[PDB]
Amino acid sequence: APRSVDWREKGYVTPVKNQGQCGSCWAFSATGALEGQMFRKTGRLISLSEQNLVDCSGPQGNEGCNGGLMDYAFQYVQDNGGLDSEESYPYEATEESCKYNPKYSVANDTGFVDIPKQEKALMKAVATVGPISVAIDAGHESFLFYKEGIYFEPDCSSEDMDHGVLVVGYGFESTESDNNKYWLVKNSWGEEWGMGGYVKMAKDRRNHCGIASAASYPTV
Numbered sequence: 001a002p003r004s005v006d007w008r009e010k011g012y013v014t015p016v017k018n019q020g021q022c023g024s025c026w027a028f029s030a031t032g033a034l035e036g037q038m039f040r041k042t043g044r045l046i047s048l049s050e051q052n053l054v055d056c057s058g059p060q061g062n063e064g065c066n067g068g069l070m071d072y073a074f075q076y077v078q079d080n081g082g083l084d085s086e087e088s089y090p091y092e093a094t095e096e097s098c099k100y101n102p103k104y105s106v107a108n109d110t111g112f113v114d115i116p117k118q119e120k121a122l123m124k125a126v127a128t129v130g131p132i133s134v135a136i137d138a139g140h141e142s143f144l145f146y147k148e149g150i151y152f153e154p155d156c157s158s159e160d161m162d163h164g165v166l167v168v169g170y171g172f173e174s175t176e177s178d179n180n181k182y183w184l185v186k187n188s189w190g191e192e193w194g195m196g197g198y199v200k201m202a203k204d205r206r207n208h209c210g211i212a213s214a215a216s217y218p219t220v
């Protein structure tokens with residue numbers, strides 16, 4: 001597997017969106033990964049509707065703006081057999097009745113794959129499959145002030161994550177070796193947060209913040 005991977009420069013990731021005041025991080029993570037997979041198959045890069053997920057994934061278990069899984073989002077997409085585009089079903093940052101329109105479905109999936117709970121499997125997945133949906137412990141206020149560099153929270157749980165995000169690749173900082181590796185992760189808090197809306201999470205630090213513990217990607 002290569003030493004550095006970035007899928008943005010290959011056309012798998014869309015611009016960084018802002019999720020506002022609504023607990024839909026799982027939505028954006030799931031979409032992002034599914035956009036990557038749809039690009040891997042068709043070659044087209046279309047922005048997918050998060051509001052479709054927020055409103056219409058009840059039966060699968062998600063709670064709209066009160067949290068939800070990405071596996072449940074993928075299951076909803078498979079059972080509903082489609083997903084509307086962002087432009088057709090825009091994101092309004094509030095739960096509503098389902099307004100799904102099969103005439104505007106631009107993506108499909110056939111199920112999900114859960115990655116084992118070690119970082120090696122995560123790396124292999126990001127290298128071979130593409131952008132991956134993962135979860136991290138971001139409850140601490142230090143994560144709120146991230147700007148640049150590798151992020152390391154000493155009091156980061158490897159087992160209790162509260163935030164869903166999208167790993168788009170990985171690399172190193174070419175300074176003195178060891179504790180120089182990082183996961184490239186796309187947050188959904190806007191472009192003004194961090195590195196244009198991105199973050200560098202600790203990599204090969206024994207599953208820092210559980211980034212490799214709730215990893216999955218949809219099948220297409």
Ligand SMILES: *[C@@](O)(C(=O)NCc1ccccc1)[C@H](C[C@@H]1CCCNC1=O)NC(=O)[C@H](CC1CCCCC1)NC(=O)c1cc2ccccc2o1
Pocket residue numbers: 020021022023024025026061062063065066067068069070135136161162163164214
């Ligand atoms: C996520 O971080 C988000 O969408 N926004 C951050 C945020 C939090 C609070 C206000 C504004 C913005 C959410 C955050 C939760 C939702 C809001 C309430 N408090 C939260 O912490 N994170 C999630 O939804 C996580 C995502 C990960 C968690 C670990 C691995 C799986 C996915 N999921 C849940 O919180 C969740 C999922 C389910 C499913 C069934 C029942 C309950 C439930 O809760």
